[PDB]
Structure formats: C-alpha cells, structure tokens
C-alpha cells in the first residue's frame, strides 16, 4: 500500500507539523485521541484495536517545542519516542546541528526511521519539512538527508523548506545557514519547494482579511498547500498524480528542482458568500503574484514547468478551457522550448475547513506548484547578503569552533554560484 | 515600583442649548 513518511526538522518543522497533522486528522476524521468515530492507510498506521499512529518524526535539538506537543491536545496521537528531542539546541548554528551536537541524535533518528519504513509495505517517498535558518533545520536536517539517501537510495525525497524573506528575517545568521544548508540540498533533496513567510503575510492581509496574523495563521494555510498536493494518494480523483509522478514531471535537470507554490481559493467566510466559485477566475487567481507563496515576482522570470492539483467538484472540461486562456495571456510568460507546460490532476474531495480557521469552506481548490526561473532571484538576493557578511568575516568563530572547518564556505558558495549560473543559461532563449 | 499594572464655580459656563443655544438660568437684560 501507498505510504509517505513526513519528516519535520527544527522549530519551524514542529509548528508546520502541528498544523499539518491538525489538517490530516480532520480530513480523515481522526480524533485527537486517535480513534475513528481505507484512505487513512497512506498517512496513519492502523494498530491493535482501531488505534491510528502518525507516520512522522518530530526531531529537534531543542527540548521545548517538542515538549509542547507532548503537553498539547495530541498527547495520545503520536507515539512517544517517535518524537525525538535533544538536550541542548543549535541556536541557529550550522556547525552545531551537523557535527558536534547532532551526531549523537542521528543514530537515534535513523533507528526510528528504519522501524517506520519496516512496518509500511510500500514507501512511496519521503516528505521533508525544515527551515534553513534554524541550526537544527540546517544542521540536523542535512545529516538526516545525507543518511536517508545512503540507506534508501532512489526513493522520493519531496521537500518543503522555509527560506528567509528579503524584507523580513529574524536572525542575522540566516543568510549563513541558508546557503550552507542549500549545498546539501542540491545533491540530495530530489524536489525542493520553497515557502516564504512574508509572502504569506501579504496573503493573509490581502485575501483572508486578518489584519494581525500569527504563525498559527501562517502554518494553517501552509498545511493546506501540503494536503492538496498529497490529496491524490489519499482520495481518488479524475486523474491521480502520485509523488513519483511529480518528480519526473517538474525536474528537467537534477540541479534545477527548486520550485514555487500557490493556492487559489483564499477568502474569508463573509467574503465567500459574495465571491462566485468557478475555476475560470479561480485558475486566474493562482497565476497572480498575490497568491504567490514566495516573495518574488513571477513576471520577471518565466514559468518553466507547472503542476496544477485540483480538489472538489472541478469538471475536467473547463479546467482544460482555463488552461487555454492563461496560455494566451501574454502577462504570464512561458519558455519557448517547453510548449507543454501543464499538469492537470483533479481530486474529488473538497477541502475540510478547520474550526477557528481563517479560510472559508469552499467546493473547489487549486494548488499550483511550479518550477520557474524567477525563483533564482530569491537565491541571488540570498547570495547578495552573503557577500556583505562573509567579506568582513563575521560570525565565523562559532562555525570554525565546533569541529566544522572553514574551507566549506568556499565550497558552499561555489555550489550556489553553480545554481545561479544554471538558472540563467537554461532560462535563456 | 508598579510596573506590572497601575491600579491607581470658577469656569461659569452660562451657556446651554435647548433647540437653540442660549443661557441656562443666570441673568440677562
């Protein structure tokens, strides 16, 4: 049977993991106690007398946020040592979580993963959740991605990653731990999907009419992106799109696999009654930069390879009519040598609205995860911050202090220069 | 220090309005 093992690394991994498993428990009807009051097999393991255990590890070196799950509403849901904590954290230091404090917890991390992969019959792929700015997300996230490829080669490693925003960030060493972890992301992570926080802030304030959002409001629609993409495995549809179908469709080159995201229906409950739900302008809303999940304008670059995932009562005709219109829209730009640039996958389950959620209950939904050349602007401005920081050799003594050498700074930068060179020459006509 | 919480005939108006502003009671002439 189908199965994915979602792996959340770091503090940002837990809060998107606490929100994702809040969405997965409603859409399959899983009670927080863990008992139902077929489709749950891909996300839950049925054990004993109707007890469902998540297929997810919450590993983080800080014992605080993982203990909040142990004292939260979901005490009886997750298996206890399936959640993994460390004695002390990395505190946004790449050298800590990768070399000196993460190496004593990886052997416990792969011990749980081996037993998780043993129970499931067919593991369709791995789902990775982390943040490059965190020391655990960068350091421990890389060494998990290193050992998973060695033990389980060629298996899908689908990754969602929280990059820092250009305007807003909450650490000066976030440009350091971003590109230092990104060098491990190119050679190992099969597909990387970017999530950017300030882009979500615009989405909540422009569309969801929440003037003062929090991280819990950001992670709930981040989780809605994840459930729409994996909805094909969970629920049957007009044309199912597996995770293995996703990698072979939007990875033209093994280095170019950094893709963006978008979610079309973004309206409040009072605003949903006035708006007409139809996949004509629902599809047009996904290609707007307002619904863009990463703060970079898509019309500077070109949409290279696009995937559309559809939920609810979407008939296959008018989605094929809306694709015809957006292709004719000159404002949206495609590259000339890839004339087929769409993936049409429709699922028959409308999304489930969480109680207290800002989003409204809708019958139709679009998730547009797309590879594009405008995502290289994110890497360029992330690189532009790195030239200013590294030239004066700031914050280096902790990186060289904790076992990690200094020569990899040239090596990590050389990989990012190889990415930005590739994104320019491939996108050129 | 309380940083947690605080827990803390000369004017002679002589003008009133009753569908038009006038004088309350005092004097005229």
């Amino acid at each position: 049977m189908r199965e994915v093992i979602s792996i959340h690394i770091g503090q940002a991994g837990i809060q998107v993991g606490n929100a994702c498993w809040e969405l997965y428990c409603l859409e399959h009807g899983i009670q927080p106690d863990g008992q139902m009051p077929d489709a749950f097999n891909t996300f839950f393991s049925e054990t004993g007398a109707g007890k469902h255990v998540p297929r997810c590890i919450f590993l983080d070196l800080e014992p605080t946020v993982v203990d909040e799950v142990r004292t939260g509403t979901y005490r009886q849901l997750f298996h206890p040592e399936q959640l993994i904590s460390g004695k002390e954290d990395a505190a946004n230091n790449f050298a800590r979580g990768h070399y000196t404090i993460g190496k004593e917890i990886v052997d416990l991390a792969l011990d749980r993963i081996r037993k998780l992969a043993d129970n499931c019959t067919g593991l369709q792929g791995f789902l990775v959740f982390n943040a490059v700015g965190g020391g655990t997300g960068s350091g421990l996230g890389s060494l998990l991605l290193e050992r998973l490829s060695v033990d389980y080669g060629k298996k899908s490693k689908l990754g969602f990653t929280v990059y820092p925003s250009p305007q807003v960030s909450t650490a000066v060493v976030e440009p350091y731990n971003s590109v230092l972890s990104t060098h491990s992301l190119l050679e190992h992570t099969d597909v990387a999907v970017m999530l950017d926080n300030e882009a979500i802030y615009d989405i909540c304030r422009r569309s969801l009419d929440i003037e003062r959002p929090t991280y819990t409001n950001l992670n709930r629609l981040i989780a809605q992106v994840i459930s729409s993409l994996t909805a094909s495995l969970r629920f049957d549809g007009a044309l199912n799109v597996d995770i293995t179908e996703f990698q072979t469709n939007l990875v033209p080159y093994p280095r170019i696999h950094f893709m963006l995201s978008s979610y079309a229906p973004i309206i409040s409950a009072e605003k949903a009654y006035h708006e007409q739900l139809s996949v004509a302008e629902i599809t047009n809303a996904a290609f707007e930069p307002a619904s863009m999940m990463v703060k970079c304008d898509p019309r500077h670059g070109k949409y290279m390879a696009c995937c559309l995932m559809y939920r609810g009562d979407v008939v296959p005709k008018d989605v094929n009519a809306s694709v015809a219109t957006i292709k004719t829209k000159r404002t949206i730009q495609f590259v000339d040598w890839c004339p087929t640039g769409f993936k049409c996958g429709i699922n028959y389950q409308p999304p489930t609205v969480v109680p207290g959620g800002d989003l409204a209950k809708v019958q139709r939904a679009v998730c547009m995860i797309s590879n594009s050349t405008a995502i290289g602007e994110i890497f360029s401005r992330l690189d532009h911050k790195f030239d200013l920081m590294y030239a004066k050799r700031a914050f280096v003594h902790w990186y060289v202090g904790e076992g990690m050498e200094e020569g990899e700074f040239s090596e990590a930068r050389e990989d990012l220069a190889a990415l930005e060179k590739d994104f320019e020459e491939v996108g050129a006509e | 220090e309380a940083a947690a919480a605080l827990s803390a005939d000369d004017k002679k108006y002589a003008v009133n309005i009753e569908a038009a502003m006038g004088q309350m009671t005092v004097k005229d002439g």
């Binding site: 909040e68 004292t71 004695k87 002390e88 650490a171 304030r205 700031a394 | 220090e1 947690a4 605080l6």
Partner: protein
C-alpha cells in the same frame, strides 16, 4: 533540561541579585517559604532552569552567593525571599577587600576561591546539562570585582564549553560612588574580555533618569533601581523557561548578537516603562512597545545610541503577540533610519516571542544591543584610568599586595583596544 547557575559577588552583587531572585520567584510562582503557589501549569514545566527539587516540594535556587564582607549576608538572609538560598552556598570571608581589586583577586581571594569552586562543583554535576553560568557583580567595587573575575577566569578553565553572562555594573558617568572606581573597572575589563563569552552593562545614572523621567516617581530607592535590573535579567531567559512561537535560548543571544569574539559587550533596555499615573492613558499595543524599545532614553547604559550604530540588535518579546506587526515594526525602524544601523549586516534585528507575559503586564520586550556607542563608556573610563595612573595615584595599596604596573599597562592596552576596534567597525 538546560540549567543556569547564578553567581553573585560582593556588596552590589548580593543585594541586587537578591531582587533578581525576588522577581523570578514571584514570576515562577514560589512563595518565600519555598513551595509552589502558581495559577497555571506552565510555570512548573521548566523549574529545573533555576531551582532544585528537594524534600517536601521545596525549590532551592541554583545560586552561589560569595563575598569577602560578612555584612551582606546579614542583609541577604534578613530580607524577604532570603530564606530560599542554601546555606552551603553562603560562602563568605572575614577581612573584606574594601573596594580593592588586588585583595579580592590575589591576597584574600586565594584562601577563598578554592572554597567557592568546591561549592560550584557540588552544584555542577548535581544537575544534568550545564547550559552555562551567569554572574552579576560590580566593577567599581573590589569584593565582587577581584574576587569575582578570578572565579570567572577559573570556571572557564574548568568548564570551557559553557557560556558566560556578566551583568556587570560600571561607574556612572557624571557621578562616582567610589574614588578608586577607574582602577577596578579597567582591571576587571581586562579579565572579562577573554573569559566572558558575553557581557551586559548596567549604569546607575542610566537607571536614575529612567526611574524619574519615565517612571514618574519622585524618590525611587535602590530597590526601585534594582527592580529594572531584576526585570531585564528575567527577560534574558524568558524563552528558556517558557514555551513560545520562536524560541531564543541564551546561546542564541550569544551567537547572534556577537559578530567577533572581542566585540561582545552589550547594552540593555526594558520596554514597557509607564508610570501609575500615565498607564491608563496609554494603549497597550505593539507599536507603543517598539517606539519605547528603540528610544535612547530607555537604555540602561551610559551610552547614547545616536552617537553610534547598532552592530546587532535583539528583542525578547513576552506574551501573545501578532508577529506580523512585530516583524514590520523592526522592518520599519530598519527602513526609517538606515544611518543609525550598521549597513554591512542586513536585517540586524532579532525577534523571538515567548507566549506568556510576565506578571501583571500582558505585552513586554527586552532589547539587547551590541551597539558601538558603548565605546564612550569604555573611553570615559579609559581616560580616567590613564589620568590616575600617570601620577601613580592610589598605587601603593595595589602593588603592596602582589601587583606590579605591568598589568596596569596591559589593562589599558586592552581598554583602548576596545574603543579602537569599536570605532573601526562603525566606519
């Protein structure tokens, strides 16, 4: 499972560190007797950071109080919340250094520092994981400076992988509490540069005008001065002992605020400072927090931040806050006046949110600033030390106990090194 050891040194350390243990015991919810009396269950989640379990549910602080004069421990035990400390940690002397760094560091410390590293070691391996040590002492005095900095040097030799906070109080700019302050300040700085992983500076006249102009109290006492000293230190460790949206442990406060190992001295400021007569007029919103946090008047150091830029800034928010307004206010202040920030570090300001506010208040913040304007605090002490030393003034008291002027020349050599390198990175 992160444990913080609190160390107090001297007359100033044992008196103002008592009030730090007053507010934490009031905020974690333990009575003067020693038992738990809090309302929520969040307080009992992380008690091990500051307290030890004992018989009968009593919580004894992980604090060693140590000095050369017996007068302070008469005052420490007699005050409120004074019974909670273990008497084995109450190691003291009989002579008293008397504002001399030489007696504390070399002559009368040598028979007692061997005793205090026996007490520290007993509480070292008693706990599971040492996160580090924090010390709050004085630099103008001698019983917490010389005796203190020798302890600070010795624990780094024994425990080099752990981290140091030094909440050291410096001499005031316009007034002086002791004559021999410039000697003991500069000799303490020369030891605190290479041993302390980070340093936070408090200044009494910076507290004086805050307690008068902003807090609108006619006569604050020393207890009112120590409260904001006690309030800021609880804001240092707010993300440790309590959950939050984004957590900043004390190692994060080191690795993020400090670009270079010598450039570790900070300045601190407590954000929600409104009087009893002006609180109800003020609206408790995070725009009102960020305007007071970035104000020059709110800082608790002798420096003025309009003179020098911030190399790195931090903010320790406590409570239930909308992080979009928190993020965009720091973005706005970075965009309103880019001259007042160091240009060659993009997005200088760090924010972390602790979900529970302190007692009474519902929204608060704790500013940590590695500003280059604090070289004026170094330079004014440095010019005082050069002027005092060039006539060899007050020197026969110091060199008579085992000192020679070679360290005094070396102490200046690191003192003017700091103001030279702090000015260099400002340009």
């Amino acid at each position: 499972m992160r444990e913080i050891v609190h160390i107090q040194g001297g007359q100033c350390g044992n008196q103002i560190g008592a009030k730090f243990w007053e507010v934490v015991s009031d905020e974690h919810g333990i009575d003067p007797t020693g038992t738990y009396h809090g309302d929520s269950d969040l307080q009992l989640e992380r008690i091990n950071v500051y307290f030890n379990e004992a018989t009968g549910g009593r919580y004894v602080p992980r604090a060693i109080l140590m000095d050369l004069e017996p007068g302070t421990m008469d005052s420490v035990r007699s005050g409120p919340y004074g019974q909670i400390f273990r008497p084995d940690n109450f190691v003291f002397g009989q002579t008293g250094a008397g504002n001399n760094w030489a007696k504390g560091h070399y002559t009368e410390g040598a028979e007692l520092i061997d005793s205090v590293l026996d007490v520290v070691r007993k509480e070292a391996e008693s706990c599971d994981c040492l996160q580090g040590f924090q010390v709050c002492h004085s630099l103008g005095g001698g019983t917490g400076s010389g005796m203190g900095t020798l302890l600070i040097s010795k624990i780094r030799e024994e425990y080099p992988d752990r981290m140091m906070l030094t909440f050291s109080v410096v001499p005031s700019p316009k007034v002086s509490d002791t004559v021999v302050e410039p000697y003991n300040a500069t000799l303490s700085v020369h030891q605190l540069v290479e041993n302390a992983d980070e340093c936070m500076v408090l200044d009494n006249e910076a507290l004086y005008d805050i307690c008068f102009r902003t807090l609108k109290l006619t006569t604050p006492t020393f207890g009112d001065l120590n409260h904001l000293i006690s309030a800021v230190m609880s804001g240092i460790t707010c993300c440790l002992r309590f959950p939050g949206q984004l957590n900043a442990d004390l190692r994060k406060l080191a690795v993020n605020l400090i670009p270079f190992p010598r450039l570790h001295f900070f300045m601190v400021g407590f954000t929600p400072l409104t009087s009893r007569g002006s609180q109800q007029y003020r609206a408790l919103t995070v725009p009102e927090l960020t305007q007071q946090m970035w104000d020059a008047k709110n800082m608790m150091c002798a420096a003025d931040p309009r003179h020098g830029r911030y190399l790195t800034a931090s903010a320790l928010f406590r409570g239930r806050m909308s992080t979009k307004e928190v993020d965009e206010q720091m973005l706005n202040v970075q965009n309103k006046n880019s001259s007042y920030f160091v240009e060659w570090i993009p997005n200088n300001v760090k924010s972390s949110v602790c979900d529970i506010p302190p007692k009474g208040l519902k929204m608060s913040a704790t500013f940590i600033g590695n500003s280059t304007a604090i070289q004026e605090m170094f330079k004014r002490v440095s010019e005082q030390f050069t002027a005092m030393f060039r006539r060899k003034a007050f020197l026969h008291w110091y060199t008579g106990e085992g000192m020679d002027e070679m360290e005094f020349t070396e102490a200046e050599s690191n003192m003017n090194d700091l103001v030279s390198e702090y000015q260099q990175y400002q340009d």
